[PDB]
Coordinates of all heavy atoms in Angstrom, one line a residue:
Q12 N 91.0 111.5 86.9 CA 91.3 112.3 85.7 C 91.0 113.8 85.9 O 91.3 114.6 85.0 CB 90.4 111.8 84.5 CG 90.6 110.3 84.2 CD 89.3 109.6 83.9 OE1 88.3 110.0 84.5 NE2 89.4 108.6 83.2
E13 N 90.5 114.1 87.1 CA 90.2 115.5 87.4 C 91.0 115.9 88.7 O 90.5 116.5 89.6 CB 88.7 115.8 87.6 CG 87.9 115.6 86.3 CD 86.5 115.3 86.7 OE1 86.1 114.2 86.9 OE2 85.7 116.3 86.6
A14 N 92.3 115.5 88.7 CA 93.1 115.8 89.9 C 93.9 117.1 89.6 O 94.1 117.5 88.5 CB 94.1 114.7 90.2
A15 N 94.3 117.7 90.7 CA 95.0 119.0 90.6 C 96.5 118.7 90.7 O 97.2 118.9 89.7 CB 94.6 119.9 91.7
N16 N 97.0 118.2 91.8 CA 98.4 117.8 92.0 C 98.5 117.1 93.3 O 97.5 117.1 94.1 CB 99.3 119.1 92.1 CG 100.7 118.8 91.7 OD1 101.3 117.8 92.0 ND2 101.3 119.7 90.8
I17 N 99.6 116.4 93.5 CA 99.9 115.6 94.7 C 100.8 116.4 95.6 O 102.0 116.6 95.3 CB 100.5 114.2 94.4 CG1 99.5 113.4 93.6 CG2 100.8 113.5 95.7 CD1 100.2 112.3 92.9
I18 N 100.2 117.0 96.7 CA 101.0 117.8 97.6 C 101.8 116.9 98.5 O 101.5 115.7 98.6 CB 100.0 118.7 98.4 CG1 100.8 119.9 99.1 CG2 99.4 118.0 99.5 CD1 99.8 120.9 99.7
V19 N 103.0 117.4 99.0 CA 103.9 116.7 99.8 C 104.0 117.5 101.1 O 104.3 118.7 101.1 CB 105.3 116.5 99.2 CG1 106.3 116.1 100.2 CG2 105.2 115.5 98.1
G20 N 103.7 116.8 102.2 CA 103.7 117.5 103.5 C 105.0 117.9 104.0 O 105.9 117.1 104.2
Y21 N 105.2 119.2 104.1 CA 106.4 119.9 104.6 C 107.7 119.6 103.8 O 108.8 119.7 104.3 CB 106.6 119.6 106.1 CG 105.5 120.2 107.0 CD1 104.9 119.3 107.8 CD2 105.2 121.5 106.9 CE1 103.8 119.8 108.6 CE2 104.2 122.0 107.7 CZ 103.5 121.2 108.6 OH 102.5 121.6 109.4
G22 N 107.5 119.2 102.5 CA 108.7 118.8 101.7 C 109.4 117.6 102.2 O 110.6 117.4 101.7
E23 N 108.8 116.7 103.0 CA 109.5 115.6 103.5 C 108.6 114.3 103.2 O 107.4 114.3 103.5 CB 109.7 115.7 105.0 CG 110.3 116.9 105.5 CD 111.8 116.9 105.4 OE1 112.4 116.1 106.1 OE2 112.4 117.7 104.7
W24 N 109.3 113.3 102.6 CA 108.7 112.1 102.3 C 108.6 111.2 103.5 O 109.5 111.3 104.4 CB 109.4 111.4 101.2 CG 109.1 111.9 99.8 CD1 109.8 112.9 99.2 CD2 108.0 111.5 99.0 NE1 109.2 113.1 98.0 CE2 108.1 112.3 97.8 CE3 107.0 110.6 99.1 CZ2 107.2 112.2 96.8 CZ3 106.1 110.5 98.1 CH2 106.2 111.3 96.9
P25 N 107.7 110.3 103.7 CA 107.7 109.3 104.8 C 108.9 108.3 104.6 O 109.2 107.9 103.5 CB 106.4 108.6 104.7 CG 105.5 109.5 103.9 CD 106.4 110.2 102.9
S26 N 109.5 108.0 105.7 CA 110.6 107.1 105.7 C 110.7 106.3 107.0 O 109.8 106.4 107.8 CB 111.9 107.9 105.5 OG 112.0 109.0 106.5
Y27 N 111.7 105.5 107.1 CA 111.9 104.7 108.3 C 112.9 105.4 109.2 O 113.8 106.1 108.7 CB 112.4 103.3 108.0 CG 111.4 102.6 107.1 CD1 111.6 102.5 105.7 CD2 110.3 101.9 107.6 CE1 110.7 101.8 104.9 CE2 109.4 101.3 106.8 CZ 109.6 101.2 105.4 OH 108.7 100.5 104.6
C28 N 112.8 105.2 110.5 CA 113.6 105.9 111.5 C 115.1 105.3 111.4 O 115.3 104.1 111.3 CB 113.1 105.7 112.9 SG 112.7 104.0 113.3
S29 N 116.0 106.3 111.5 CA 117.4 105.9 111.3 C 117.9 105.4 112.7 O 117.2 105.4 113.7 CB 118.2 107.1 110.9 OG 118.0 108.3 111.7
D30 N 119.2 105.0 112.7 CA 119.8 104.5 113.9 C 120.1 105.6 115.0 O 120.2 105.3 116.2 CB 121.1 103.7 113.6 CG 120.8 102.7 112.5 OD1 119.9 101.9 112.6 OD2 121.6 102.7 111.5
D31 N 120.2 106.8 114.5 CA 120.4 107.9 115.4 C 119.1 108.3 116.2 O 119.1 108.5 117.4 CB 120.9 109.2 114.7 CG 122.3 109.0 114.1 OD1 123.1 108.2 114.7 OD2 122.6 109.6 113.1
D32 N 118.0 108.3 115.5 CA 116.7 108.7 116.1 C 116.1 107.5 116.9 O 115.2 107.8 117.7 CB 115.7 109.1 115.0 CG 116.2 110.3 114.2 OD1 117.1 111.1 114.8 OD2 115.7 110.5 113.1
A33 N 116.6 106.3 116.7 CA 115.9 105.2 117.3 C 116.2 105.1 118.8 O 117.3 105.4 119.3 CB 116.4 103.9 116.7
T34 N 115.2 104.7 119.6 CA 115.4 104.6 121.0 C 115.3 103.1 121.5 O 116.0 102.8 122.5 CB 114.3 105.4 121.8 OG1 113.0 105.0 121.3 CG2 114.5 106.8 121.6
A35 N 114.5 102.3 120.9 CA 114.3 100.9 121.4 C 115.5 100.1 121.0 O 116.3 100.4 120.3 CB 113.0 100.4 120.8
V36 N 115.5 98.9 121.7 CA 116.6 97.9 121.4 C 116.1 96.7 120.7 O 116.9 95.8 120.4 CB 117.4 97.6 122.7 CG1 118.0 98.8 123.3 CG2 116.5 96.9 123.7
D37 N 114.8 96.5 120.5 CA 114.3 95.4 119.8 C 114.1 95.7 118.3 O 113.9 96.9 117.9 CB 113.0 94.9 120.4 CG 112.0 96.0 120.5 OD1 112.4 97.1 120.9 OD2 110.8 95.8 120.1
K38 N 114.2 94.7 117.5 CA 114.1 94.9 116.0 C 112.7 95.1 115.6 O 111.8 94.4 116.0 CB 114.6 93.7 115.3 CG 114.9 93.9 113.8 CD 115.2 92.6 113.1 CE 116.5 92.1 113.4 NZ 116.9 90.9 112.6
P39 N 112.4 96.2 114.9 CA 111.0 96.5 114.6 C 110.5 95.7 113.4 O 111.2 95.6 112.4 CB 111.0 98.0 114.3 CG 112.4 98.3 113.8 CD 113.3 97.3 114.5
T40 N 109.3 95.2 113.5 CA 108.7 94.5 112.4 C 108.1 95.5 111.4 O 107.8 96.7 111.7 CB 107.6 93.5 112.8 OG1 107.0 92.9 111.7 CG2 106.6 94.3 113.6
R41 N 108.0 95.1 110.1 CA 107.6 96.0 109.1 C 106.9 95.2 108.0 O 107.6 94.7 107.0 CB 108.7 96.9 108.5 CG 110.0 96.2 108.2 CD 111.0 97.2 107.7 NE 111.6 98.0 108.8 CZ 112.7 97.7 109.4 NH1 113.4 96.6 109.1 NH2 113.2 98.5 110.4
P42 N 105.6 95.0 108.0 CA 104.9 94.4 106.9 C 104.9 95.3 105.7 O 104.5 96.5 105.8 CB 103.5 94.1 107.4 CG 103.3 95.1 108.6 CD 104.7 95.3 109.1
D43 N 105.4 94.8 104.5 CA 105.6 95.6 103.4 C 104.4 96.0 102.7 O 104.0 97.2 102.6 CB 106.6 94.9 102.5 CG 107.4 95.9 101.6 OD1 106.9 96.8 101.0 OD2 108.7 95.7 101.6
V44 N 103.7 95.1 102.1 CA 102.5 95.4 101.2 C 101.2 95.0 101.9 O 100.2 95.2 101.2 CB 102.7 94.6 99.9 CG1 104.1 94.8 99.3 CG2 102.4 93.1 100.1
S45 N 101.2 94.5 103.1 CA 100.0 94.1 103.7 C 99.4 95.2 104.6 O 98.2 95.1 105.0 CB 100.2 92.9 104.6 OG 99.9 93.2 106.0
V46 N 100.1 96.3 104.8 CA 99.5 97.5 105.5 C 99.6 98.7 104.7 O 98.9 99.7 104.9 CB 100.2 97.7 106.9 CG1 99.8 96.6 107.8 CG2 101.7 97.8 106.7
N47 N 100.5 98.8 103.7 CA 100.6 100.0 102.9 C 99.7 99.9 101.7 O 100.1 99.6 100.6 CB 102.1 100.2 102.4 CG 103.1 100.2 103.6 OD1 102.7 100.5 104.7 ND2 104.3 99.7 103.3
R48 N 98.4 100.1 102.0 CA 97.4 100.0 100.9 C 96.2 100.9 101.4 O 96.1 101.2 102.5 CB 97.0 98.5 100.7 CG 96.6 97.8 102.0 CD 96.2 96.4 101.7 NE 95.2 96.3 100.6 CZ 93.9 96.4 100.9 NH1 93.5 96.5 102.2 NH2 93.0 96.4 99.9
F49 N 95.4 101.2 100.4 CA 94.3 102.1 100.6 C 93.1 101.5 101.4 O 92.7 100.3 101.1 CB 93.8 102.7 99.3 CG 94.7 103.7 98.7 CD1 95.6 103.4 97.7 CD2 94.7 105.0 99.2 CE1 96.4 104.3 97.1 CE2 95.5 105.9 98.6 CZ 96.4 105.6 97.6
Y50 N 92.6 102.2 102.3 CA 91.4 101.8 103.1 C 90.3 102.8 102.9 O 90.4 103.9 103.5 CB 91.7 101.6 104.6 CG 92.8 100.7 104.9 CD1 94.1 101.1 105.1 CD2 92.6 99.3 105.0 CE1 95.1 100.2 105.4 CE2 93.6 98.4 105.3 CZ 94.8 98.8 105.5 OH 95.8 97.9 105.8

């Protein structure tokens, strides 16, 4: 309740790597809600 604002680093949101930027040839795994949580 005493927060200022939520800053965003360099105006860019976190995302997944596109097919242009990708280097590997294996399918990457992505646990959805089991790792995106507060520690």
